[PDB]
C-alpha cells in the first residue's frame, strides 16, 4: 500500500525457480523519458559487480548488460515497450536454467542468457525515476 | 530536512535572477546517477522547456530546449566539478544573453538564451538526487 524508499536495496538469494516481483509507477510522463533500473549485485555494495542489469528508458528502449571486474560488457538492446504511459506496472524477473525471463504486466517481454551463475547474486537494487509499492523475492519447485 | 523529488516550483525569472539548488546524488559515480533541472513555460511537465540542464554524474552535462514537444540542438560539456558521494550547490544565474551555471562556487557551464527567461513559469528538479534546498532569488 505505502511507498517504499527509492533507491530500494534488498539482500537476495537466487537460483533456478526464483522470481523477483516489483510493482511501481514512473515518476514522469513518457515525453520526459523517465528511467527504471534493476541491478542484481554480487555483493552488499553498490560498486560491486552486476550479474544482471535491466534498464528501461520509458517509451524508448530497454538495455540489458552485466558489469564484470568493474567494466560493462556486451549490451543487449530491446525496442519492445509493453509499459504504458502514466500507469502502474508489474515487473517480474524469473530465473530459468539458462536465462532470466522478464515479464511486464503478465506478458513475457525480455530474455537475457546467464553470463554468471544466478547463485552469485547477494543483493537487488531498484532505482531511477519510479515510485515503488512492492518488492518480493519468491521461490518455486 | 529533505524536499520531495521530483520537486516542482512556480518561478518568475529575469536578468539578475538566480536559482540555487543544494542536493546530493543518490548513487556513487560508478553507477552514473542523473540530475535534471528544467525551466518550463507552463505548470505542466509536458510543456515546453526554455532551459534543460542534465548531469550524468562523472560523465557529462547536456543542455538543450524543447519547443512544440521536440528537442532542439544539444550543447554538451565534459566539465565535471561535482564530487563523488558529496553534497553540491548548483547556482543558475540569468544574464542578459545567457544562463551562467556555478557548481560549488566554480563557474562551470553557460547556455545562450533561445527564448526570453520571462517565458519561464515553473522549475522542475528531478532524477537521482536528494534535495535539501531550492531557492529563487533576485538582485539587479
Curated annotation (Swiss-Prot), chain B:
GO terms for molecular function: carbohydrate binding; identical protein binding. This is Galectin-10. Forms hexagonal bipyramidal crystals, known as Charcot-Leyden crystals, in tissues and secretions from sites of eosinophil-associated inflammation and some myeloid leukemias. One of its GO terms (biological process) is regulation of T cell cytokine production. The record marks 135 as: Not glycosylated. The modification N-acetylserine is found at residue 1. The keyword Cytoplasm applies. The keyword rRNA processing does not apply. SUPFAM superfamilies: Concanavalin A-like lectins/glucanases. It is found in: Cytoplasm, Cytosol; Cytoplasmic granule. Pfam families: Gal-bind_lectin. Expressed abundantly in the bone marrow. Expressed exclusively by eosinophils and basophils. Not detected in monocytes and neutrophils. Expressed in CD25-positive regulatory T-cells (Treg) (at protein level). Found in intestinal tissue from patients with Celiac disease, expression is directly related to the histological grade of mucosal damage and to the number of eosinophils found in the duodenal lesion (at protein level). Found in sputum of patients with eosinophilic inflammatory diseases such as asthma (at protein level). It comes from Homo sapiens (Human). Interacts with CEL. Regulates immune responses through the recognition of cell-surface glycans. Essential for the anergy and suppressive function of CD25-positive regulatory T-cells (Treg). PANTHER family: GALACTOSIDE-BINDING SOLUBLE LECTIN 13-RELATED (PTHR11346:SF120), GALECTIN (PTHR11346).
Amino acid at each position: 500500500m505505502s511507498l517504499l524508499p527509492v533507491p530500494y536495496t534488498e539482500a537476495a538469494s537466487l537460483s533456478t525457480g526464483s522470481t523477483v516481483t516489483i510493482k511501481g509507477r514512473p515518476l514522469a510522463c513518457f515525453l520526459n523519458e523517465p528511467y527504471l533500473q534493476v541491478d542484481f549485485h554480487t555483493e552488499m555494495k553498490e560498486e560491486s559487480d552486476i550479474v544482471f542489469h535491466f534498464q528501461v528508458c520509458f517509451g524508448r528502449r530497454v538495455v540489458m548488460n552485466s558489469r564484470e571486474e568493474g567494466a560493462w560488457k556486451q549490451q543487449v538492446e530491446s525496442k519492445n515497450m509493453p509499459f504504458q504511459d502514466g500507469q502502474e506496472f508489474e515487473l517480474s524477473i524469473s530465473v530459468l536454467p539458462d536465462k532470466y525471463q522478464v515479464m511486464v504486466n503478465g506478458q513475457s517481454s525480455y530474455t537475457f542468457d546467464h553470463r554468471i551463475k544466478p547463485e552469485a547474486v547477494k543483493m537487488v537494487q531498484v532505482w531511477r525515476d519510479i515510485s515503488l509499492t512492492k518488492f518480493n523475492v519468491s521461490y518455486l519447485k
